[PDB]
Design a protein around this ligand. Structure first.
Ligand code: MG
Ligand code: MG
Ligand code: MG
Ligand code: MG
Ligand code: MG
Ligand code: MG
Ligand code: MG
Ligand code: MG
Ligand code: MG
Ligand code: MG
Ligand code: MG
Ligand code: MG
Ligand code: MG
Ligand code: MG
Ligand code: MG
Ligand code: MG
Ligand code: MG
Ligand code: MG
Ligand code: MG
Ligand code: MG
Ligand code: MG
Ligand code: MG
Ligand code: MG
Ligand code: MG
Ligand code: MG
Ligand code: MG
Ligand code: MG
Ligand code: MG
Ligand code: MG
Ligand code: MG
Ligand code: MG
Ligand code: MG
Ligand code: MG
Ligand code: MG
Ligand code: MG
Ligand code: MG
Ligand code: MG
Ligand code: MG
Ligand code: MG
Ligand code: MG
Ligand code: MG
Ligand code: MG
Ligand code: MG
Ligand code: MG
Ligand code: MG
Ligand code: MG
Ligand code: MG
Ligand code: MG
Ligand code: MG
Ligand code: MG
Ligand code: MG
Ligand code: MG
Ligand code: MG
Ligand code: MG
Ligand code: MG
Ligand code: MG
Ligand code: MG
Ligand code: MG
Ligand code: MG
Ligand code: MG
Ligand code: MG
Ligand code: MG
Ligand code: MG
Ligand code: MG
Ligand code: MG
Ligand code: MG
Ligand code: MG
Ligand code: MG
Ligand code: MG
Ligand code: MG
Ligand code: MG
Ligand code: MG
Ligand code: MG
Ligand code: MG
Ligand code: MG
Ligand code: MG
Ligand code: MG
Ligand code: MG
Ligand code: MG
Ligand code: MG
Ligand code: MG
Ligand code: MG
Ligand code: MG
Ligand code: MG
Ligand code: MG
Ligand code: MG
Ligand code: MG
Ligand code: MG
Ligand code: MG
Ligand code: MG
Ligand code: MG
Ligand code: MG
Ligand code: MG
Ligand code: MG
Ligand code: MG
Ligand code: MG
Ligand code: MG
Ligand code: MG
Ligand code: MG
Ligand code: MG
Ligand code: MG
Ligand code: MG
Ligand code: MG
Ligand code: MG
Ligand code: MG
Ligand code: MG
Ligand code: MG
Ligand code: MG
Ligand code: MG
Ligand code: MG
Ligand code: MG
Ligand code: MG
Ligand code: MG
Ligand code: MG
Ligand code: MG
Ligand code: MG
Ligand code: MG
Ligand code: MG
Ligand code: MG
Ligand code: MG
Ligand code: MG
Ligand code: MG
Ligand code: MG
Ligand code: MG
Ligand code: MG
Ligand code: MG
Ligand code: MG
Ligand code: MG
Ligand code: MG
Ligand code: MG
Ligand code: MG
Ligand code: MG
Ligand code: MG
Ligand code: MG
Ligand code: MG
Ligand code: MG
Ligand code: MG
Ligand code: MG
Ligand code: MG
Ligand code: MG
Ligand code: MG
Ligand code: MG
Ligand code: MG
Ligand code: MG
Ligand code: MG
Ligand code: MG
Ligand code: MG
Ligand code: MG
Ligand code: MG
Ligand code: MG
Ligand code: MG
Ligand code: MG
Ligand code: MG
Ligand code: MG
Ligand code: MG
Ligand code: MG
Ligand code: MG
Ligand code: MG
Ligand code: MG
Lengths: 44, 272
RNA sequence: CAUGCUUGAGGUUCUAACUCUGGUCCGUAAUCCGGAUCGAGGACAGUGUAUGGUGGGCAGUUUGACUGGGGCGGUCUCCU
RNA sequence: CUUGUCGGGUAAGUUCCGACCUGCACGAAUGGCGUAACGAUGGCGGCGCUGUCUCCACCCGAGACUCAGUGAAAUUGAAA
RNA sequence: GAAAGACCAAGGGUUCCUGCGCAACGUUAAUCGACGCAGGGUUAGUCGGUUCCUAAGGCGAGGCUGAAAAGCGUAGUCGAUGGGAAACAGGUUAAUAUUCCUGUACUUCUGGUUACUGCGAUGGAGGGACGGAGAAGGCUAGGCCAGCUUGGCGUUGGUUGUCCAAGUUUAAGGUGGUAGGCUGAAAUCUUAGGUAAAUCCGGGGUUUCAAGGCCGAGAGCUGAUGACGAGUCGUCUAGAUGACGAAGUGGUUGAUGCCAUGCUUCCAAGAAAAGCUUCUAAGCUUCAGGUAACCAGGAACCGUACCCCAAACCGACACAGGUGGUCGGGUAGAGAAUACCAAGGCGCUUGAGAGAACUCGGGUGAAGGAACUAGGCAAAAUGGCACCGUAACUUCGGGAGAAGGUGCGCCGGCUAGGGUGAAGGAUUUACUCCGUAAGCUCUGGCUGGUCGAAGAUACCAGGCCGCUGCGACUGUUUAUUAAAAACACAGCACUCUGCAAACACGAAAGUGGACGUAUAGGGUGUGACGCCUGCCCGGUGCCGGAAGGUUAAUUGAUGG
RNA sequence: UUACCACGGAGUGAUUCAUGACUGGGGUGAAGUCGUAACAAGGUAGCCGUAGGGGAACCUGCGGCUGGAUC
């Protein structure tokens, strides 16, 4: 049976990447919210 | 002519084809082709704005010349071609100094002809001139509305209009829809009617022939749920218990929708 | 009754406001956008504000109690 | 009402096919009445075939059973 | 064994190899491991990226729009799943190799020297450059057979021979311009065109010739007196090493691979841009730049281990699930079905017994033959090729493989055809034409004999028929209890819409409809086809009318 | 033992008789019911073909004929 997670490294970066979040001001709210809580990763 | 296929299959019984043996069957003229890509009925917000559109064959766009403003130079018809974008045929002209061009093919033009344009041209079918110097009572096609913009009216297969009256700087002509309209006499037109007038005798024959043209199935509103259509709902097979209406709530059995009010003076009398 | 200076509505016309998802010039190496100039319409259209009509397209809600289970029926205040 | 009544099919048919008209409460593009071909569509009837059945019998593998190793689960107030 | 074998891509990330280990992990033990510790291991001008080009789409200076955030979009510049330079064979490690080594190639750039010269783009032309189906060929890989070389003479009758086994290999490139496909060619005089120019492209006139020009598999030759090759010998220690090294040819068959982005045909009419060739503008002109020959030098950076239809990816698991593309041998066979094998891989990480009921998956079954049951559910049955034969009805295609029947193994006798192909013959003398005995290979015909219970013997492989309801048909649907009579459908009708269209998404700009134009576009119902579709405009909608009555903001006479 | 072949089997058609719930017209009947279509110019002249309509004879449209009276 086909499952929901089909990995793709290029599609992962283009939706959830660092430059994708920096493009819009709502993505930049996500990054500052994760810096405030102290996340080690901050982006995938 | 029209060709009726034999019932060798279940899907061939009711196919009636419009097969023209005079059409060119080589490649089109490449320097007058540009790419067009399908839209699916979606606008730049990505939303379906016109439904029942999708699929079909890949097509090039043919740069048809609707202005016909090479006045005074004679032309010759090289061939009549098939256009995926019209229901009418197109003709490849060759003017007296190179300059090949596509125009909408008139009814009788095949292989020679002269098809000159401008003032002082003869009154044979296929010639283009301003509406001032067109005899009253003649049949015209490819009518221009604004000077310098090109043909907009009477362009599909077998279309024509009648020049009925002439008075002042304007001129009145009866449209194929039964409407009397006044047009600026400076605008241009072509004599005769459009080719391929037998296009209306065809019969697609099967459901897959509609999908070849990029049309998707129509689901009727009485087959839906109340949340989808105003006609939806009911136990068993019902009949749209209200007055018939659009998916967005607009009456469709006789209610008028024209609300222009700016071009009203150009309408002599409506099509009713 | 005549004229005069006003004034409600009606019709016609003009061009100069406005409009053009019409042509050609420039910015420019550009089917965007501006400016210029021709052409068309024209005090209309259109937008702001005020107001009548329509409007399950959409919204927030209401739709009683008793009752030999509920519903249907009946009853709900006062006098003998 | 109803397994209406008559005919056919069966030894026997509340289902099936053909009719009658008393249509509780058919009916003409929420189409009426037919229709060759088509259907993992509904009903009924035949031929062949048979462990479906009278009515089960024997045989072959995998478990169940015993020995060695590893080792769960729902449940549970306490139980002479 | 069309995989349970090999190889790419995605995904993973050291799981790869070697020493030392067994606590935990491994559904049991483990000396073993995809497990623990420590070392090692991935080598490129040609492979894949990067660099060059663009598609859908994204972002978008200025701009237009919008309470703000922001939306749309022009110039532009990102974005492969596509376009665009060039390498093969052999050897080698415990682990890499088209990357290292050996041999033989190819592409592109830089700097010099010589010789001769009109150079120049972001702009113009050409080219790149393309659909579905189908059919005739030509060829190659691959497969068989024969010959050859080396070895053998068989635990049991025979086996020195029409006997047995193995091997009989070799690329890119260069040369060659073939089967075949497309196309008329040259000279000269001009020019309402290609936004300007143009010797280039396009258009026109005249003369001459009947021949050029462009693509194009493959053969042959050469690469290659070399590599490889069973094996033989010498040294070291059942194994390593160095040297040597046989034969290595002919015939048939033949692809779904190549010619082929070809050819024919049909409608649903079948990417862009760059690299590339050429023309010229602004500019140089005796610097620049260009074309040839020779000499010298260069080709950076990143990925290369290993799994990869799985125990390493997605499913919490060493999980009967899922996962794109390529290769794909023999005997039978129409076949990539099926069966038995090859190369290669594996026996699925608890075993041993014993042979109760009962459960699961199967085999056979007396006499009946649907009596079973809601219902022939399930099972049994049919099943191939050739020939004979086949009803109602019909939209004339069908129904139809209707129904039903006959033959089929093996060994001989006679006999008829096709393909390939020596010798010969012809002229265009050579990658050519005709034609060929034997050999090899593929189709048949009529005549006997013979064995068994049975010859389509296994696997494989339609059950058929008669009345009716529904839906015309092929299609679609409730991922995970409903596949249908439901949805769609071709056809039919009503209605709206004159183009800045109606309509839809958007506070708006704008976008779709549509680079469409009433034979068009939207909505609504019905649902192939045949015969038809009757009466009612009182209600509620829609359409037309404008006389009269009622009637909003607004204005403000009059009165208090 | 083979060849020929009668009886008898199996499958599927054609044709022809009898019969069949129920249905369609026709003929013959008697002092029945409704009308009055034709024969006179039958009181709207009749017939012929075709189409629609109607309790029924029949009516109406289109084309045709005189086998139509007055004149
Ligand atoms: Mg998920
Ligand atoms: Mg921050
Ligand atoms: Mg068809
Ligand atoms: Mg192009
Ligand atoms: Mg539609
Ligand atoms: Mg189209
Ligand atoms: Mg069609
Ligand atoms: Mg439809
Ligand atoms: Mg609809
Ligand atoms: Mg519909
Ligand atoms: Mg439904
Ligand atoms: Mg529904
Ligand atoms: Mg919705
Ligand atoms: Mg609703
Ligand atoms: Mg229902
Ligand atoms: Mg109902
Ligand atoms: Mg319903
Ligand atoms: Mg628009
Ligand atoms: Mg106004
Ligand atoms: Mg107004
Ligand atoms: Mg307003
Ligand atoms: Mg509602
Ligand atoms: Mg609502
Ligand atoms: Mg509500
Ligand atoms: Mg509330
Ligand atoms: Mg509530
Ligand atoms: Mg209340
Ligand atoms: Mg209560
Ligand atoms: Mg009660
Ligand atoms: Mg009580
Ligand atoms: Mg009680
Ligand atoms: Mg009580
Ligand atoms: Mg109680
Ligand atoms: Mg009943
Ligand atoms: Mg009954
Ligand atoms: Mg009965
Ligand atoms: Mg029964
Ligand atoms: Mg029955
Ligand atoms: Mg019945
Ligand atoms: Mg009844
Ligand atoms: Mg009904
Ligand atoms: Mg009706
Ligand atoms: Mg009904
Ligand atoms: Mg019916
Ligand atoms: Mg189907
Ligand atoms: Mg279906
Ligand atoms: Mg049926
Ligand atoms: Mg029965
Ligand atoms: Mg038993
Ligand atoms: Mg057993
Ligand atoms: Mg034990
Ligand atoms: Mg135990
Ligand atoms: Mg197989
Ligand atoms: Mg295997
Ligand atoms: Mg494998
Ligand atoms: Mg990876
Ligand atoms: Mg992982
Ligand atoms: Mg390791
Ligand atoms: Mg290992
Ligand atoms: Mg070890
Ligand atoms: Mg131990
Ligand atoms: Mg363990
Ligand atoms: Mg263990
Ligand atoms: Mg296990
Ligand atoms: Mg390890
Ligand atoms: Mg772009
Ligand atoms: Mg943008
Ligand atoms: Mg900006
Ligand atoms: Mg780019
Ligand atoms: Mg790529
Ligand atoms: Mg590519
Ligand atoms: Mg490429
Ligand atoms: Mg390896
Ligand atoms: Mg090398
Ligand atoms: Mg170009
Ligand atoms: Mg391509
Ligand atoms: Mg083609
Ligand atoms: Mg093709
Ligand atoms: Mg061979
Ligand atoms: Mg020998
Ligand atoms: Mg022996
Ligand atoms: Mg012996
Ligand atoms: Mg060779
Ligand atoms: Mg070669
Ligand atoms: Mg040739
Ligand atoms: Mg590697
Ligand atoms: Mg590797
Ligand atoms: Mg693999
Ligand atoms: Mg395991
Ligand atoms: Mg697995
Ligand atoms: Mg798959
Ligand atoms: Mg095979
Ligand atoms: Mg098969
Ligand atoms: Mg097997
Ligand atoms: Mg085996
Ligand atoms: Mg093996
Ligand atoms: Mg196991
Ligand atoms: Mg059993
Ligand atoms: Mg069983
Ligand atoms: Mg069994
Ligand atoms: Mg059995
Ligand atoms: Mg037995
Ligand atoms: Mg038995
Ligand atoms: Mg028996
Ligand atoms: Mg029987
Ligand atoms: Mg029974
Ligand atoms: Mg019983
Ligand atoms: Mg039962
Ligand atoms: Mg069954
Ligand atoms: Mg059975
Ligand atoms: Mg079975
Ligand atoms: Mg079976
Ligand atoms: Mg039948
Ligand atoms: Mg048969
Ligand atoms: Mg015998
Ligand atoms: Mg049969
Ligand atoms: Mg049968
Ligand atoms: Mg019936
Ligand atoms: Mg029924
Ligand atoms: Mg259906
Ligand atoms: Mg169906
Ligand atoms: Mg039907
Ligand atoms: Mg039908
Ligand atoms: Mg029907
Ligand atoms: Mg199909
Ligand atoms: Mg089918
Ligand atoms: Mg389901
Ligand atoms: Mg379902
Ligand atoms: Mg189904
Ligand atoms: Mg199901
Ligand atoms: Mg459905
Ligand atoms: Mg629309
Ligand atoms: Mg329409
Ligand atoms: Mg619609
Ligand atoms: Mg329907
Ligand atoms: Mg239907
Ligand atoms: Mg339907
Ligand atoms: Mg129907
Ligand atoms: Mg009304
Ligand atoms: Mg009325
Ligand atoms: Mg009105
Ligand atoms: Mg039979
Ligand atoms: Mg029969
Ligand atoms: Mg008989
Ligand atoms: Mg009879
Ligand atoms: Mg009878
Ligand atoms: Mg009787
Ligand atoms: Mg009469
Ligand atoms: Mg009378
Ligand atoms: Mg009379
Ligand atoms: Mg009378
Ligand atoms: Mg008379
Ligand atoms: Mg007659
Ligand atoms: Mg008559
Ligand atoms: Mg009529
Ligand atoms: Mg009649
Ligand atoms: Mg009448
Ligand atoms: Mg008539
Ligand atoms: Mg008459």
């Amino acid at each position: 049976m086909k499952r929901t997670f089909q990995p793709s490294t290029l599609k992962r970066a283009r939706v959830h990447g660092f430059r994708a979040r920096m493009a819009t001001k709502n993505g930049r709210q996500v990054l500052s919210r994760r810096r405030a809580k102290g996340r080690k990763r901050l982006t995938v | 002519a029209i060709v009726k296929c034999k019932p060798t299959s279940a899907g061939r019984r009711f196919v009636v084809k419009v097969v023209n043996q005079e059409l060119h069957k080589g490649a089109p003229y490449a320097p007058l082709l540009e790419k067009k890509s399908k839209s699916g009925g979606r606008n730049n917000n990505g939303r379906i704005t016109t439904r029942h559109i999708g699929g079909g064959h890949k097509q090039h766009y043919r740069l048809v010349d609707f202005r016909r403003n090479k006045d005074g130079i004679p032309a010759i018809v090289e061939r009549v071609e098939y256009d995926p974008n019209r229901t009418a045929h197109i003709a490849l002209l060759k003017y007296a100094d190179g300059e090949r061009r596509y125009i909408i093919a008139p009814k009788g033009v095949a292989a020679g002809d002269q098809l000159i344009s401008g003032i002082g041209a003869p009154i044979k079918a296929g010639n283009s001139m301003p509406l001032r110097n067109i005899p009253v009572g003649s049949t015209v096609h490819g009518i221009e509305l604004k000077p310098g913009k090109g043909a907009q009216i009477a362009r599909s297969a077998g279309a024509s209009a009648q020049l009925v009256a002439r008075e002042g700087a304007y001129v009145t002509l009866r449209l194929r829809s039964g409407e009397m309209r006044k047009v600026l006499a400076e605008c241009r037109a072509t004599l005769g009617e459009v080719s391929n007038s037998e296009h209306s005798l065809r019969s697609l024959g099967k459901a897959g022939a509609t999908r070849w043209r990029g049309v998707r199935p129509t689901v009727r509103g009485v087959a839906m749920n109340p949340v989808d259509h105003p006609h939806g709902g009911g136990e068993g097979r019902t009949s749209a218990g209200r007055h018939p209406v659009s998916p967005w709530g607009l009456q469709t059995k006789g209610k008028k929708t024209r609300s222009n009010k700016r071009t009203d003076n150009m309408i002599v009398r409506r099509r009713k």
